[PDB]
């Protein structure tokens, strides 16, 4: 990690930790720095699934709209990097969050299904699939 690059990935650092609440600014900013150094992608996807992991119930939901922002806008790389954990990081966020913040990645995990009216998923079927039959099985969604 050479110069420009540890530049560019402790501001990222530094402005995903002032993401506390559903800010639109902040996370167009993300959105657009994601877009703009694809170079730094690797390091962008661990800082936002290791905020995932270590902040409180209500500041997950808004770290993974960041996720989904990115995802939708800029697409790939990110969509294949997210792709690989999305399961295991959703199934634990749900566990550890309260029963509103529940109905939000329920939704966000609808429009997954069909993003901006493409017809095409947005991430790979199998994390999908896993998803919703967790979502089943805690009484989340329908039986088929």
Avoid at 81 to 103: A, E, H, Q
Wanted: hydrophobic share 40%.
């Amino acid at each position: 990690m050479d110069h420009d690059t540890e530049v560019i990935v402790k501001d990222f650092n530094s402005i995903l930790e002032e993401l506390t609440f559903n800010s639109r600014p902040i996370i167009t900013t993300l959105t657009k720095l994601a877009e703009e150094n694809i170079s730094c992608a690797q390091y962008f996807v661990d800082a936002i699934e290791s905020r995932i992991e270590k902040c409180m119930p209500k500041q997950k939901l808004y770290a993974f709209y960041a996720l989904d922002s990115i995802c939708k806008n800029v697409g790939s790389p990110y969509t294949i990097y997210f792709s690989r954990n999305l399961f295991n990081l959703y199934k634990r966020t749900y566990l550890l969050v309260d029963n509103t913040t529940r109905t939000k990645l329920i939704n966000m995990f609808k429009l997954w299904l069909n993003p901006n009216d493409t017809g095409l998923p947005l991430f790979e079927g199998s994390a999908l699939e896993k998803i919703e039959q967790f979502l089943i099985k805690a009484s989340a969604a329908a039986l088929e």
